[PDB]
Amino acid sequence: AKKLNPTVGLWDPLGIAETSPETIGWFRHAEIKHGRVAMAAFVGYCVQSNGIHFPWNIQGWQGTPVVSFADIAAAGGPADQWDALSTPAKLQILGVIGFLEMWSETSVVLKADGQEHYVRGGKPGYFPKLSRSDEMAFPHPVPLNLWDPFGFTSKMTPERKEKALLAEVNNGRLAMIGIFGMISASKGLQVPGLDTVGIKPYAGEVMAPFAAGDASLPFVSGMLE
Amino acid sequence: AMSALPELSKKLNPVLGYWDPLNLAELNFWGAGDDATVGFLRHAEIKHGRVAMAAFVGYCVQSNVHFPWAPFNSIPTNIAPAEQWAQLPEAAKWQIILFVGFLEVYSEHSFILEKYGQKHYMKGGKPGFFPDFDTMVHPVPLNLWDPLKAYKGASAERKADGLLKEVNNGRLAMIGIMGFCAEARVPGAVPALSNIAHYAGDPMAPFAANFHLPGFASXXXXXX
Amino acid sequence: SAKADLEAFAKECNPVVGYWDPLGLADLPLWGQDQDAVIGWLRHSEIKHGRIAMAGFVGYIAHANGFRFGGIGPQNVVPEGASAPEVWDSIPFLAKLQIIGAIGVLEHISEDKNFLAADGMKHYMRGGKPGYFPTFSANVHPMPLNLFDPFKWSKNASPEKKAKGLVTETNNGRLAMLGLFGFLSESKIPGSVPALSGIIPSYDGDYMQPFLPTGPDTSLWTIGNLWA
Ligand code: CLA
Ligand SMILES: CC(=O)O[C@H]1CC(C)(C)C(=C=C/C(C)=C/C=C/C(C)=C/C=C/C=C(C)/C=C/C=C(\C)C(=O)C[C@@]23O[C@]2(C)C[C@@H](O)CC3(C)C)[C@](C)(O)C1
Numbered sequence: 197a198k199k200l201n202p203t204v205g206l207w208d209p210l211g212i213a214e215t216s217p218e219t220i221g222w223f224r225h226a227e228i229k230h231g232r233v234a235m236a237a238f239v240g241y242c243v244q245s246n247g248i249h250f251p252w253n254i255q256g257w258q259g260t261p262v263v264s265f266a267d268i269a270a271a272g273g274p275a276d277q278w279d280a281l282s283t284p285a286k287l288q289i290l291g292v293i294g295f296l297e298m299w300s301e302t303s304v305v306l307k308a309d310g311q312e313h314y315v316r317g318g319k320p321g322y323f324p325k326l327s328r329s330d331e332m333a334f335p336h337p338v339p340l341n342l343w344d345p346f347g348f349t350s351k352m353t354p355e356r357k358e359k360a361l362l363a364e365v366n367n368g369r370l371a372m373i374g375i376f377g378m379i380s381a382s383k384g385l386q387v388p389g390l391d392t393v394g395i396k397p398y399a400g401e402v403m404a405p406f407a408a409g410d411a412s413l414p415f416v417s418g419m420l421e
Numbered sequence: 422a423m424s425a426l427p428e429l430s431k432k433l434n435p436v437l438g439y440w441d442p443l444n445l446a447e448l449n450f451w452g453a454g455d456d457a458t459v460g461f462l463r464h465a466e467i468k469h470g471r472v473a474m475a476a477f478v479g480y481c482v483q484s485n486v487h488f489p490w491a492p493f494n495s496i497p498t499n500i501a502p503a504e505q506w507a508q509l510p511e512a513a514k515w516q517i518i519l520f521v522g523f524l525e526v527y528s529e530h531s532f533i534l535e536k537y538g539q540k541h542y543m544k545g546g547k548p549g550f551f552p553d554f555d556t557m558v559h560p561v562p563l564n565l566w567d568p569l570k571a572y573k574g575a576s577a578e579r580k581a582d583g584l585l586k587e588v589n590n591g592r593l594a595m596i597g598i599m600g601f602c603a604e605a606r607v608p609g610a611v612p613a614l615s616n617i618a619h620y621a622g623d624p625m626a627p628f629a630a631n632f633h634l635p636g637f638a639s640x641x642x643x644x645x
Numbered sequence: 646s647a648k649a650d651l652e653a654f655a656k657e658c659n660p661v662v663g664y665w666d667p668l669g670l671a672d673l674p675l676w677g678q679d680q681d682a683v684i685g686w687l688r689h690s691e692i693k694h695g696r697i698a699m700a701g702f703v704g705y706i707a708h709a710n711g712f713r714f715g716g717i718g719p720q721n722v723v724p725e726g727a728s729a730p731e732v733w734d735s736i737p738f739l740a741k742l743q744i745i746g747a748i749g750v751l752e753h754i755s756e757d758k759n760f761l762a763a764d765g766m767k768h769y770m771r772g773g774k775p776g777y778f779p780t781f782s783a784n785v786h787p788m789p790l791n792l793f794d795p796f797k798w799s800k801n802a803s804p805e806k807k808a809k810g811l812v813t814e815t816n817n818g819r820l821a822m823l824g825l826f827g828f829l830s831e832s833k834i835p836g837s838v839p840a841l842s843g844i845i846p847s848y849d850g851d852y853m854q855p856f857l858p859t860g861p862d863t864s865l866w867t868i869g870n871l872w873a
């Protein structure tokens with residue numbers, strides 16, 4: 197896609213374009229993945245700020261302690277709400293996300309599925325299907341999938357697929373801008389924000405603190421920011 | 422050979438085949454050719470997998486129950502299983518280790534293994550060949566591998582599939598037993614478990630405290 | 646031959662600057678040892694200095710921030726927070742001796758003709774590749790894996806990629822030399838470089854004396870510590 201927007205064109209202020217094809221593919225895949233993750237994060241942050249606390253945690257969720265899901269939800273938006281989960285929960289969520297990312301980055305599964313060069317290179321944004329042959333052979337048949345789990349996109353034209361990909365790229369860029377602005381509005385700044393938007397945990401790029409082994413770092417208080 | 426290991430690893434896992442960051446398939450650390458190193462590494466891996474999976478099953482069994490044969494309850498009431506091993510009699514540990522050493526010297530001896538029809542694993546034998554116990558005039562009722570038979574009619578493909586399954590099972594079980602020992606020694610190591618507790622003393626030490634022995638039991642000045 | 650190779654290498658290091666030899670060092674016969682041997686010695690010294698400067702820069706950052714390896718080892722004696730010049734001040738004296746001894750072992754392996762002819766190549770002063778560290782197929786006991794490429798990430802790259810890697814190595818080495826001596830100059834005279842003023846504290850000892858503040862004789866060893 198040379199230019200989805202006709203009034204913008206090829207905007208390369210830093211000269212990142214006109215480079216090696218691997219770098220261009222990596223940049224395109226990074227843009228697509230960041231846009232998708234930012235759209236999901238914006239939707240989740242809006243749902244958490246509105247209040248969508250799950251009626252759950254009936255035994256086995258806390259782990260012998262008393263920690264309900266609504267108790268975790270009753271702390272803010274992305275804030276102490278996201279920073280108040282247990283260390284095993286955050287560790288296992290990050291591990292599941294890493295397993296999904298490593299499965300997406302696997303070149304054997306991509307070559308079996310008909311994709312192109314890995315590290316999200318040729319055909320960027322393509323997640324391989326986790327089913328069928330020469331994949332997940334030991335039990336775990338995965339009745340659901342990652343993309344189109346209900347078969348909502350069984351048939352689509354290649355021109356329609358390209359138009360939807362361009363729309364996804366533009367919407368992901370807009371959602372990345374909106375998510376950065378929403379994190380800023382949680383921290384303040386910006387235009388007139390209002391709408392409460394709680395307080396901010398750490399500074400924007402908050403992590404999973406209150407752990408053990410490598411989390412004894414009081415260094416997150418300065419470094420400007 | 423060198424090419425057979427990647428094929429065996431691909432059979433063990435088709436997605437990830439021939440994973441050796443440390444290489445180790447070319448270090449001829451015995452000076453007996455490349456095939457000897459491959460055979461030694463395969464035999465060491467298979468032995469460690471068998472011992473580790475048996476140790477995991479034994480830790481699961483002995484962490485809750487015991488055997489009612491002859492006062493085997495005061496030793497079972499010694500908290501962790503490693504402390505129970507350290508609380509066993511000196512003759513018990515000595516005879517157990519000597520029994521395992523007798524099995525090792527019977528398996529590695531390349532004349533009894535030649536009676537079974539194979540050779541040493543460094544000279545072309547299969548990795549893991551604890552052989553039939555028919556060498557001395559002392560009639561044994563059951564052997565080591567397949568004691569109560571039930572495996573004579575097995576196929577070659579089934580044998581290869583079982584060998585790959587045992588290799589992968591030991592590949593998991595070594596990490597499992599290591600994690601169990603780490604959680605026993607240093608709490609908070611295994612982040613997915615918080616039930617196993619109590620100290621192991623020195624986990625890699627067969628003799629401790631009550632073991633008298635002819636000197637050299639200098640358990641003082643231990644490390645972490 | 647060697648001089649033309651210097652001209653070419655200086656061209657690909659910086660085409661704007663090119664061959665910059667103000668003090669004519671590519672023409673002095675050092676030990677009455679021709680031109681090519683002198684050029685090889687100078688290139689080997691430059692590459693060794695650059696590699697040591699890069700490693701020292703990363704180690705200086707690790708020591709000044711505080712990056713202890715673990716327990717029981719020699720990091721137990723060094724206090725928590727001492728700045729990088731003082732971590733080579735509180736490790737045991739024998740630890741410094743054995744570190745410098747292992748570095749000398751690596752130097753001797755790097756210039757041993759038996760280690761070097763095992764790979765089919767010659768001395769850098771006798772028509773070899775400057776900065777090349779040999780393999781370990783001459784030891785007496787087999788080494789698990791070599792020093793240059795500990796894993797097999799290399800050896801499939803093109804020779805042109807290797808040449809570009811060498812040029813980047815030399816340029817990064819020179820820049821690391823400048824950075825590490827900026828650290829050392831701020832640690833001695835205040836306001837030497839402007840950016841590091843107030844960041845790196847002052848040091849009183851000698852930077853060129855390995856054993857003037859001799860470390861303690863602490864014998865960090867348990868289990869069989871029969872040597873007191
Ligand atoms: C000790 C480290 C060291 C060594 C051995 C070399 C060696 C070499 N360099 Mg090199 N260089 C270094 C550091 C070093 N460099 C640094 C830090 C920079 C960045 C500023 C450069 C930048 C550089 C360029 C741009 C070029 C070289 C080139 C060369 C080669 C021949 C030219 C020459 O006369 O040598 C360099 C001269 C010396 C090392 C002088 C010896 C040291 C004297 C005796 C001490 C001077 C101290 C004094 C206080 C400095 C005052 C600084 C200031 C007041 C002016 C030779 C292989 C040329 C080349 O590409 O060939 C491969 C070339 O064109 N060098
Ligand atoms: C009797 C008893 O005790 O039973 C117990 C059972 C049990 C289960 C213990 C109990 C519970 C609680 C439950 C059910 C807990 C489970 C909670 C669950 C299952 C929470 C999912 C989170 C998913 C996330 C955050 C995904 C993020 C992933 C995101 C946002 C991505 O974008 C992924 C991404 O891939 C894309 C899409 C594209 C890639 O290019 C890029 C990456 C990789 C980034 C109970 C209630 O206690 C009862």
Ligand SMILES: CC(=O)O[C@H]1CC(C)(C)C(=C=C/C(C)=C/C=C/C(C)=C/C=C/C=C(C)/C=C/C=C(\C)C(=O)C[C@@]23O[C@]2(C)C[C@@H](O)CC3(C)C)[C@](C)(O)C1
Nearest residue numbers: 474477478572575583590593594596597598600611613614
């Ligand atoms: C056709 C034929 O001939 O007969 C067949 C069948 C038959 C008769 C059974 C055969 C046999 C003989 C026998 C006795 C076979 C049985 C062998 C046996 C006993 C095999 C144990 C494995 C133990 C494992 C994998 C342990 C994993 C352990 C794991 C994965 C862990 O602990 C990991 C984990 O800890 C962490 C790291 C953190 C924790 O928070 C979470 C968990 C717990 C997950 C044959 C002859 O072989 C083949």
Ligand SMILES: CC(=O)O[C@H]1CC(C)(C)C(=C=C/C(C)=C/C=C/C(C)=C/C=C/C=C(C)/C=C/C=C(\C)C(=O)C[C@@]23O[C@]2(C)C[C@@H](O)CC3(C)C)[C@](C)(O)C1
Nearest residue numbers: 699700702703810817820821823824825827838839840841
């Ligand atoms: C006015 C004022 O004061 O300004 C100040 C600013 C400031 C910042 C304070 C100053 C400073 C300090 C500076 C500039 C310090 C610079 C330090 C520098 C330049 C340090 C290089 C490290 C390179 C390493 C470690 C290489 C690793 C190389 C590695 C690990 C490899 O070999 C790997 C690899 O090769 C393989 C094996 C195969 C290849 O295919 C791929 C790669 C390449 C990955 C100054 C100078 O004082 C000036």
Ligand code: KC2
Nearest residue numbers: 696697699700774775776777778793807810811813814817
């Ligand atoms: C302190 C340690 C250290 C550092 C920080 C460092 C940094 C870099 C950088 C980043 C700036 C690059 C890009 C780079 C690249 C290359 N290095 Mg270096 N290197 C270090 C150590 C060694 C050793 C011991 C050897 C070596 C070599 C090569 C070759 C092969 C050339 C060839 O095969 O033609 C290439 C391409 C080998 C050699 O041949 O040197 C002539 C050799 O033995 N390197 N190296």
Ligand SMILES: CC1=C(C#C/C(C)=C/C=C/C(C)=C/C=C/C=C(C)/C=C/C=C(C)/C=C/[C@@]23O[C@]2(C)C[C@@H](O)CC3(C)C)C(C)(C)C[C@H](O)C1
Nearest residue numbers: 751788789790791792793794795796867868869870871872
């Ligand atoms: C207690 C006892 C005794 C004893 C004893 C004994 C045997 C004590 C032994 C102590 C011993 C044996 C101490 C070794 C240290 C080895 C080190 C630090 C090696 C580091 C090695 C390193 C850091 C290597 C790194 C690299 O190799 C890597 C990994 C890849 C290569 O590419 C690059 C290089 C080479 C750099 C008595 C008294 C003698 C008799 C008594 O009866 C019992």
